[PDB]
Scaffold this active site. Structure first.
Site, PDB file in Angstrom:
ATOM      1  N   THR B  15       0.831  -1.198   0.000  1.00  0.00           N
ATOM      2  CA  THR B  15       0.000   0.000   0.000  1.00  0.00           C
ATOM      3  C   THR B  15       0.871   1.256   0.000  1.00  0.00           C
ATOM      4  OG1 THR B  15      -1.830  -1.090   1.153  1.00  0.00           O
ATOM      5  CG2 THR B  15      -1.721   1.315   1.303  1.00  0.00           C
ATOM      6  N   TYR B  29      -7.918   0.354  -2.516  1.00  0.00           N
ATOM      7  CA  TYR B  29      -6.923   1.025  -3.350  1.00  0.00           C
ATOM      8  C   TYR B  29      -6.160  -0.010  -4.178  1.00  0.00           C
ATOM      9  CZ  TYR B  29      -4.904  -0.578   0.979  1.00  0.00           C
ATOM     10  OH  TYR B  29      -4.601  -1.357   2.072  1.00  0.00           O
ATOM     11  N   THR B  95       1.693  -4.320   4.144  1.00  0.00           N
ATOM     12  CA  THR B  95       1.523  -4.529   5.581  1.00  0.00           C
ATOM     13  C   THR B  95       0.902  -5.870   5.949  1.00  0.00           C
ATOM     14  OG1 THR B  95      -0.720  -3.555   5.739  1.00  0.00           O
ATOM     15  CG2 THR B  95       1.152  -2.040   5.915  1.00  0.00           C
ATOM     16  N   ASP B  96       0.101  -6.422   5.049  1.00  0.00           N
ATOM     17  CA  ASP B  96      -0.585  -7.673   5.338  1.00  0.00           C
ATOM     18  C   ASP B  96       0.256  -8.870   5.768  1.00  0.00           C
ATOM     19  OD1 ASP B  96      -2.923  -6.323   4.983  1.00  0.00           O
ATOM     20  OD2 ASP B  96      -3.409  -7.177   3.025  1.00  0.00           O
ATOM     21  N   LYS B 168       0.756  -7.294  12.932  1.00  0.00           N
ATOM     22  CA  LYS B 168      -0.320  -6.376  12.571  1.00  0.00           C
ATOM     23  C   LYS B 168      -1.475  -6.774  13.480  1.00  0.00           C
ATOM     24  CE  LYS B 168      -2.819  -4.536   8.599  1.00  0.00           C
ATOM     25  NZ  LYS B 168      -2.852  -4.412   7.114  1.00  0.00           N
ATOM     26  N   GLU B 289       0.855 -34.252  27.839  1.00  0.00           N
ATOM     27  CA  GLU B 289      -0.416 -34.949  27.686  1.00  0.00           C
ATOM     28  C   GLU B 289      -1.094 -34.621  26.361  1.00  0.00           C
ATOM     29  OE1 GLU B 289       0.857 -34.140  30.502  1.00  0.00           O
ATOM     30  OE2 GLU B 289       0.888 -36.229  31.195  1.00  0.00           O
TER      31      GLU B 289
END
Lengths: 327, 327, 327, 327
Positions: B15, B29, B95-96, B168, B289
């Site tokens: 972005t 966008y 950013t993802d 994020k 366990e």
């Protein structure tokens, strides 16, 4: 007349009723190993707060909680809240999936009487166990007249959170339950309740979802979003007949080319796709160019609950989307 | 110093290089629309901080970033940092999945020279775009002598986070990148860097993970944990030859009966099972366990990255588990 | 035998040693009411983690802790840690001003051996009291070899925080101690210590502050910044012989026309002015247009401690300002 | 007309109107350097959201904002909101004391039309200045029908916070305004407003505080609490005619033996003492053993504002204490 409010403690299990070999063991305990009576007698102080009756609904780790059982829980709570002799209910539950069970009842309880979920991060046999105090606070909240009409609540660590926003943010801390962006409905300090907010969302008495006279819920699965996410998982879900798929997407419900292919196959088979986020907080905004609906601020776990309920009333994508913007 | 540091800006998209129709358009966008030199020109001030050299590596939305591309990115950076005329590298990224790509290089870059990932939450065409300042700050950090040997960093919103802890946390806010329990390595205020912490984990020049010559990585998938989670999702994963499975479990990596069934199968087929948490933060503690290994404080996304790299050199659970407690 | 470490538990008082009538009381109790040996016999498990010795240094509510007492505490700890038979020290303290006492020792204890401050938000006689587990964790931290050379630490609510960054952020909750921007040094989960960070600041053995031989400290007061703040508060401080004034200012140490006149009177009279912030977090940046020095990321309480110590060595503003950027 | 809402932008100054020499200058600028017309013309997109009218109320740095000016600001807003042609008001203000001015109006504006305070952390001339988007969002909120009856709001960094809970938590970051325990009223993402909470406190139209015809307010000062706090500061305030004293105490409003002595003196002189907390968040609970009233969850800055207003109604301790629990 002036007397203690009648409160019913409906136990279902969890660490609050768990136990370990010693008091220094905070993990590797057996959740749901203690009866509701055991818990009540551990905090005889509650007797002074209200007329309480314990009822063992179940005793299991919340990770094993299922939609059909939760459905039964909602029906029982609606039964109880109908009686003039019941002022409110407190539900002991495991911390792992309490946000799911709590949000379900938040949407299906047809009463403004207080429904309070309570849990504990440390087993009842642990040193400085948090269960006793949490339980005591839960009862005080359920018995207070100020608590009515606020929706389903989760009480723990002195905080009062709405089922709609609260979530377990940390895997092992006492202060794990938070609503980063939305805050708490109130707090309990010095045995006094301080209400701060009222959620601006529909719930309980103003909810269109009624599960009374319902045997089962529509099947909905959750798929994660990450680099190299496989298209085959969407194929697997479709094939096992899911009615809906909640996508815990990257960022604001972003989808890779593989996820997009998988989502279209689903939309083709009449399966409803809801894009949420794996981040933990925030709004997934609408985007006409991406497939599926958007979850607003509902996280994956919460989105699934509402998607299941929405499908019991409609299939219209436009109607389901508005549900996500108002509940 | 009289000599301006030599910084190479490696663009991959995101972005930060996103474009929209109007300045008021912050969502929907077109990510990866602008070129690297265009970003540099939009912030001529960077030229006063260092001798920058822009190189276009790719230009896509990070949701489509794949392991094979990240692998090549790591090999390209190792390549540049080996040169005596390159003091630091700045990588523009979406950013993802930046936390995934950043942690990968954090484990594979064999240099103590600064490697800084920079990104933006608002498109470059938006009013009050954050990219310009984030880029300026990233270059400052990459060109600062103090920044050496701190591991891979992610610079955004005046903060400097370690690739090992940063994530994020919000789907749409500018302040989305946080490390709740670990805090930031430092902050940038008034054109000055304030370093606060040094992570107490192995990385870069001290990492055993060598990816020289590799062209692909072991396949690892992530499955979610929730009420009514299906066992068939594990069957599907195993059937498609995954080498490891990262589980985003309820609470502290808790597993339902169905999940355990699926995990037993995976283990029999020799698939490595790593139990993490969907909560967002915290330590998933050991539990003999329960099946599989534990992710320590690594979230699902970071867990998958370390597991893939671990499988490139070992399949011994005792060794992989140790990696998770030290990296 | 080759086993248990030697830990001295220095008791100073605090709610952790506080007692109330019933367990329902979490407020209105008496701090510093229980003896050190009583705290030890209360949590016998501590004796399986180390060879503990209890010492009653004092028994007072921390709001009454004074510089002269903290000074003696520092000197006593230095003598204790100089012995070959002492591996670490645990100091029980009230929560109200522990961040001040803890930071003082952080700058004056000349040893790499662990110095761990521990406290409790609930009184020992309260239901679900946090003291027992807090103390157990403090002893485990102090006795662990990985804990050496990390600076003075504050252990509470499963978290390990640096005295330089930690602060009481909430007036009444169990999870009050946080370092919003800097995070925790580590956490204790399931009886295991997970270290995450090492602070990038000078402390203990690398500190120039030596209080051995000192019997008194320079007087330093703190004045708040707010709309309509009075100039006369500065006149009063000056008239009473303060050597320094810490200003808990609005925003980034911003001053009104009245505060400026006040600071100028202070400076003209030889008083050192330090501008901090009332916000709670962040960097107060240098500003050539405003009088006084800036506190970096030190909050008013921490800033007062450092300023007092700085004044026992110099009155050179250039040197004092540098202290604030490195300690 | 135009069917667009009529919004008046009342400018008071601040960094949002701040101007600095260079673009890299985020500190050392001039607050209140631009006019209201310059701000509107800088972001003409606002004109697509509503018919805006600018009004230069003043132009100063908020650290210099005084009660007498805030008084006039409140009176002016009341007459503006009384008109048929004014649907909402946006007030530009410096960030340093916006929580003080905002809370004052929150309690004195006798209208349910939106009153939105907007500010900026970076100067107008800075790279990636936040002011433009903040203003655009403030105008959107003020013009939305959903926004009425919510009390006074502070809009900044995509968040909508209530004047009763919001506070500047960090000295220099963009995401400084938060309400840790109470969350935000709502958020703005993708040019859409998502409301989350409604505060459960009295305000605006239901407030009993009216400042019509008043020219001056009762004097109230704030004293800090810390180790070795001086008694002479209490004497100084008393001697200068304060009618109220807000104590930013240690922990839950804890007081040292010196603070108590000073407080008892103030009380015998008719001074109202209000115990708050320096911690930053939380409840200061009632305590019969300590002198003065308690601030509930109001921090020092907010408490001072409410105490001044309470004193324009009565001096009775019990009534003032109730105001603090309901406003």
């Amino acid at each position: 007349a002036d007397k203690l409010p009648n409160i019913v403690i409906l136990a279902t299990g969890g660490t609050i009723a768990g136990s370990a070999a010693t008091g220094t063991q905070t993990t590797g305990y057996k959740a749901g190993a203690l009866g509701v009576d055991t818990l009540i007698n551990a905090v005889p102080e509650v007797k002074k707060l209200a007329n309480v009756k314990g009822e063992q609904f179940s005793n299991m780790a919340s990770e094993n909680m299922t939609g059909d059982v939760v459905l039964k829980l909602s029906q029982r709570v609606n039964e109880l809240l109908a009686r003039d002799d019941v002022d409110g209910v407190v539900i002991t539950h495991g911390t792992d999936t309490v946000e799911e069970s709590a949000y379900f009842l938040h949407l299906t309880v047809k009463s403004d009487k207080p429904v309070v979920f309570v849990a504990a991060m440390r087993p009842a046999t642990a040193i400085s166990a948090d269960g006793p105090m949490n339980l005591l606070e839960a009862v005080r909240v359920a018995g207070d007249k100020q608590s009515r009409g606020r929706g389903v609540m989760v009480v723990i660590n002195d905080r009062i959170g709405s089922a709609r926003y609260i979530t377990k943010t940390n895997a092992s801390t006492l202060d794990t339950f938070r609503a980063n962006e939305e805050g708490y409905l109130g707090v309990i300090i010095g045995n006094r309740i301080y209400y701060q907010n009222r959620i601006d969302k529909l719930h309980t008495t103003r909810s269109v979802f009624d599960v009374r006279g319902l045997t089962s819920l529509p099947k909905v699965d959750i798929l994660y979003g990450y680099q190299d996410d496989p298209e085959y998982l969407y194929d697997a879900a479709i094939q096992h007949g899911v009615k809906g798929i909640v996508y815990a997407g990257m960022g604001a419900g972003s989808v890779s080319v593989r996820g997009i292919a998988g989502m279209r196959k689903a939309l083709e088979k009449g399966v409803v796709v809801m894009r949420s986020t794996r981040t933990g907080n925030g709004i997934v905004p609408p985007d006409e160019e991406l497939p599926g609906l958007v979850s607003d601020s509902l996280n994956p776990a919460h989105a699934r609950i509402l998607l299941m309920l929405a499908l019991t009333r409609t299939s219209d994508p436009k109607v389901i989307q508005e549900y996500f913007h108002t509940y």
